[PDB]
Design a protein around this nucleic acid. Structure first.
Ligand SMILES: [Mg+2]
Ligand SMILES: [Mg+2]
Ligand SMILES: [Mg+2]
Ligand SMILES: [Mg+2]
Ligand SMILES: [Mg+2]
Ligand SMILES: [Mg+2]
Ligand SMILES: [Mg+2]
Ligand SMILES: [Mg+2]
Ligand SMILES: [Mg+2]
Ligand SMILES: [Mg+2]
Ligand SMILES: [Mg+2]
Ligand SMILES: [Mg+2]
Ligand SMILES: [Mg+2]
Ligand SMILES: [Mg+2]
Ligand SMILES: [Mg+2]
Ligand SMILES: [Mg+2]
Ligand SMILES: [Mg+2]
Ligand SMILES: [Mg+2]
Ligand SMILES: [Mg+2]
Ligand SMILES: [Mg+2]
Ligand SMILES: [Mg+2]
Ligand SMILES: [Mg+2]
Ligand SMILES: [Mg+2]
Ligand SMILES: [Mg+2]
Ligand SMILES: [Mg+2]
Ligand SMILES: [Mg+2]
Ligand SMILES: [Mg+2]
Ligand SMILES: [Mg+2]
Ligand SMILES: [Mg+2]
Ligand SMILES: [Mg+2]
Ligand SMILES: [Mg+2]
Ligand SMILES: [Mg+2]
Ligand SMILES: [Mg+2]
Ligand SMILES: [Mg+2]
Ligand SMILES: [Mg+2]
Ligand SMILES: [Mg+2]
Ligand SMILES: [Mg+2]
Ligand SMILES: [Mg+2]
Ligand SMILES: [Mg+2]
Ligand SMILES: [Mg+2]
Ligand SMILES: [Mg+2]
Ligand SMILES: [Mg+2]
Ligand SMILES: [Mg+2]
Ligand SMILES: [Mg+2]
Ligand SMILES: [Mg+2]
Ligand SMILES: [Mg+2]
Ligand SMILES: [Mg+2]
Ligand SMILES: [Mg+2]
Ligand SMILES: [Mg+2]
Ligand SMILES: [Mg+2]
Ligand SMILES: [Mg+2]
Ligand SMILES: [Mg+2]
Ligand SMILES: [Mg+2]
Ligand SMILES: [Mg+2]
Ligand SMILES: [Mg+2]
Ligand SMILES: [Mg+2]
Ligand SMILES: [Mg+2]
Ligand SMILES: [Mg+2]
Ligand SMILES: [Mg+2]
Ligand SMILES: [Mg+2]
Ligand SMILES: [Mg+2]
Ligand SMILES: [Mg+2]
Ligand SMILES: [Mg+2]
Ligand SMILES: [Mg+2]
Ligand SMILES: [Mg+2]
Lengths: 122, 87, 81, 80
RNA sequence: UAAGGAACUCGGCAAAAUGACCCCGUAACUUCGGGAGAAGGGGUGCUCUAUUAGGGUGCAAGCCCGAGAGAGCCGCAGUGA
RNA sequence: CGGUAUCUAACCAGAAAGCCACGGCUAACUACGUGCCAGCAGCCGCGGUAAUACGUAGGUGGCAAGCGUUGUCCGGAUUUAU
RNA sequence: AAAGAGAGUUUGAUCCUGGCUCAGGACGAACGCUGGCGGCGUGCCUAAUACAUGCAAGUCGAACGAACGGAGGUCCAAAGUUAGUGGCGGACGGGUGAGUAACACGUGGGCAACCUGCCUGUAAGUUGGGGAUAACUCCGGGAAACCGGGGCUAAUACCGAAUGAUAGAGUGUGGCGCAUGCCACGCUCUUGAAAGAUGGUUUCGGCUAUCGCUUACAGAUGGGCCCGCGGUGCAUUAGCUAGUUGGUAGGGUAAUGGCCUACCAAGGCAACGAUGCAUAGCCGACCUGAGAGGGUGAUCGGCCACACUGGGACUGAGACACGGCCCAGACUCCUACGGGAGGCAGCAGUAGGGAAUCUUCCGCAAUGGACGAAAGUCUGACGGAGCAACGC
């Protein structure tokens, strides 16, 4: 459950290191995004020398949340943090490698490149 | 410890020094005490050797090489060493 | 490794490691028992002491300890009694 | 046998236990002018039990390392 | 009080958070006194060594004061309100 | 290495010379063209109509399968002086 | 015996002072024009940037597993010249100069405070037992690196015993020193060793040769530690330090030592430059100079440090180990998504940076290395060839 003014750390190789949410795409009155949803966001903290600079407006996808998703089989998954991967106009990441586990639901949202690079797809 | 043969001189023109050194050191590198010279180019081989420090090193356990053994045999160091061992 | 000798060397390394660790542990345990006996009361202690020295001397014959080390340990723990 | 180095200096500090500090002075040519210049270096010496007093000329001799920085022992005290 | 954490509002109003004792450590500036409890950290329970090491009191009997260390033990949590 | 070094015979002036510089420092000058332009240059500085300093031609000087330019160090520099 | 060259330029003309410029020599040099040969040498100075491809460390059947001719049964065939466990070597040889202002290097000593496989010499011995395990063969997990379980067998593989200490203690005698202590010898008790393989003879038992294995003592060799002196810029870098300074006991190492621990005292270094910042491998040596000095560390030789970055240990006489192992980090690659593999500052070679630097060659013939009793195998060390007027 991520809405505007919510911060979540970045989980790939790009220069960004923390990001604040600006808007949730999908509808006129939409107010909450979860695993597999694309958001507009800004960079609040960046590592020196990175490609992505501080104060930049970028799009990104949600890979794990503290209140995860429920599967059709009646099972649940939850993580210990909210994470984020910066993506391009298409569904390809702007970084080189992904850190930490990644939810399986992205395989159902055609995010095939991010799934391949993840160390674990839970 | 071997009484070895060190090569120097010029391209296609080798000259040799009969020298004692350790087997772990480079051929042209560190050595202990040079004792003689050996010139192969001349048809009659000219080999000069101390013949006194050589016997001391042989007594102390300095095993030579094949050609050094041949030179010591021709110059009589090996035969005198055998005589010293007998006597 | 990518040399045919290195694999044999490493295998021999684990074998020798296990063997030497076993004997070293046995010798340390013997020394520990002797010093425990010597520190508190008298009891046998001296009776233990002999075989403790044995555990050192044979060890030198095995090759897992220096002769000076064995002599030094024997003299140092011989001062407890 | 062999021999060890011996230095004759003056006791400066004797407030340690069983050991003192001794300054040894010598002269040397300069690098480019050849003038005498004083050159004082401080060593640490070992006594039997706190005999030497400050400002007393003593002769000390070389030995093995007795401590972290301690390589000399007191040979005798020439005078006060 | 789930997730978020000022997005509320004229304005963080109200509420929430810190809070005791011991130790480490502490900036620009300065009227040289300060700033300073700056900031930022670590330790607190019970049992045995142990009528302690040592102090106050008294002629002695005895009675009060109690820091460091070690070994351990129990909870999510030891200035457990 | 290797038919390699070397040696033996026959033919051939034939198949084999370039770079920098020339007012003084520093060895070595004439003509043409240009006219404070084109340009040269380490310094003194040359170029405004008679240019031994600019470009070319002839000549001369130095070196030579090399010759010039640049960068760094020492000398000249007694310009850190024992 | 050696022993040093100046010129232009401030002025209307001078003489001093003073700076600037030039005439010489040398490069791991570069660029431009040009270009015949031979001999001897040199060639990533920048990115210790990233690496395709091939080769650089293996060897012993004298300790345990081959085809043929061919005993024997017109058909198959017994015995006779060729994988792995184990031993030695991989710590040598080869490459880079990142880091390091310190016992790293040079020079001169000390160790009565030390170690050392192979090599040499000498004195003794190699006497008796045991339980296994690869290899091999079945059962499974397997995408693949490879993992487990059951059974079977050798040794110079491993582990006890007999005996043997100049190893520990206790003592004595004599001679001695540089304080701690050194040397010769004697006495009693307690511990510590081994392995056999290729032949000869003899009787066949025995005996014996060579190579082997265990212990001790010397030599030689290679290392370890300590110390005096010596080689840079900044004070617009003045205080630094607390296992620090010393002692009492202990632990540890081949050895001394706050190397490490507990206790006790508050010490120690510094204007003779402590501490800090910056640069830098050190020397023999090279260039220049009349010399004193100044600049540099190309080639070669000696020492030191490093091996993608950081940490650690095992085996071993010797490593905290370039082409060995474990963990973390960045990068490259394979995956069936569970997980695996790699390190050219080795020889050639590719990309990038540069103003700028070479063949993906031949051979162990010579010298030297490792293994073996030897033949012999390996050796991008090395011996040679190719390119570049780069130098004489
Ligand atoms: Mg030979
Ligand atoms: Mg035994
Ligand atoms: Mg030893
Ligand atoms: Mg001494
Ligand atoms: Mg809430
Ligand atoms: Mg919550
Ligand atoms: Mg805020
Ligand atoms: Mg609003
Ligand atoms: Mg607002
Ligand atoms: Mg308020
Ligand atoms: Mg404040
Ligand atoms: Mg608990
Ligand atoms: Mg030919
Ligand atoms: Mg010819
Ligand atoms: Mg003809
Ligand atoms: Mg003709
Ligand atoms: Mg001709
Ligand atoms: Mg002719
Ligand atoms: Mg002609
Ligand atoms: Mg020509
Ligand atoms: Mg002209
Ligand atoms: Mg001309
Ligand atoms: Mg000419
Ligand atoms: Mg001068
Ligand atoms: Mg001039
Ligand atoms: Mg050229
Ligand atoms: Mg040309
Ligand atoms: Mg030539
Ligand atoms: Mg380099
Ligand atoms: Mg084999
Ligand atoms: Mg080397
Ligand atoms: Mg170097
Ligand atoms: Mg057996
Ligand atoms: Mg068996
Ligand atoms: Mg068996
Ligand atoms: Mg015995
Ligand atoms: Mg005896
Ligand atoms: Mg002495
Ligand atoms: Mg005796
Ligand atoms: Mg025994
Ligand atoms: Mg033999
Ligand atoms: Mg053998
Ligand atoms: Mg010097
Ligand atoms: Mg120098
Ligand atoms: Mg001690
Ligand atoms: Mg450097
Ligand atoms: Mg030269
Ligand atoms: Mg001069
Ligand atoms: Mg040089
Ligand atoms: Mg070089
Ligand atoms: Mg060198
Ligand atoms: Mg490397
Ligand atoms: Mg690299
Ligand atoms: Mg070991
Ligand atoms: Mg290696
Ligand atoms: Mg390599
Ligand atoms: Mg290379
Ligand atoms: Mg290139
Ligand atoms: Mg060879
Ligand atoms: Mg050979
Ligand atoms: Mg090979
Ligand atoms: Mg080579
Ligand atoms: Mg070569
Ligand atoms: Mg070149
Ligand atoms: Mg040439």
């Amino acid at each position: 459950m991520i809405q505007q003014e919510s911060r979540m750390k970045v989980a790939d190789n790009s220069g960004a290191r923390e990001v604040l949410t600006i808007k949730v795409l999908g509808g006129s009155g939409r107010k909450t995004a979860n695993i597999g949803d694309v958001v507009v966001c800004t960079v609040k903290q960046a590592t020196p020398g990175g490609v992505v600079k501080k104060g930049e407006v970028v799009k990104a996808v949600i890979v794990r949340t503290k209140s995860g998703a429920r599967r059709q089989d009646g099972s649940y998954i939850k993580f210990d943090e909210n994470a984020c991967v910066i993506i391009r106009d298409d569904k390809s990441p702007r970084g080189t490698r992904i850190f930490g586990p990644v939810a399986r639901e992205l395989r159902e949202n055609n995010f095939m490149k991010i799934v391949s690079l993840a160390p674990e797809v839970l | 410890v071997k009484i070895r043969l060190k090569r120097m001189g010029s391209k296609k023109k080798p000259f040799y020094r009969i020298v004692v050194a350790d087997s772990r050191f480079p051929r042209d590198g560190r050595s202990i005490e040079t004792i003689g010279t050996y010139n192969p180019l001349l048809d009659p081989v000219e080999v000069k050797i101390d013949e006194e420090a050589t016997l001391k090193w042989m007594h102390n356990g300095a095993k030579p090489s094949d050609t050094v053994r041949n030179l010591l045999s021709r110059e009589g160091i090996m035969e005198k060493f055998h005589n010293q061992k007998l006597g | 490794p990518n040399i045919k000798s290195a694999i044999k060397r490493v295998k021999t390394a684990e074998t020798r490691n296990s063997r030497n660790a076993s004997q070293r542990s046995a010798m340390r345990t013997a020394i520990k028992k002797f010093d425990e006996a010597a520190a508190n009361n008298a009891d046998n202690a001296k009776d233990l002491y002999v075989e403790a020295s044995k555990k050192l001397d044979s060890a030198v014959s095995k090759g897992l300890i220096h002769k000076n080390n064995a002599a030094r340990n024997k003299s140092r723990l011989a001062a407890k009694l | 046998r062999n021999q060890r180095k011996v230095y004759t200096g003056r006791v400066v500090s004797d407030k340690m236990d069983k050991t003192i500090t001794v300054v040894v002075e010598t002269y040397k040519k300069h690098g480019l002018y050849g003038k005498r210049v004083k050159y004082s270096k401080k060593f640490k010496a070992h006594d039997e039990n706190n005999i030497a007093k400050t400002g007393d000329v003593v002769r000390i001799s070389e030995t093995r390392p007795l401590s972290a920085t301690k390589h000399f022992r007191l040979l005798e005290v020439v005078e006060e």
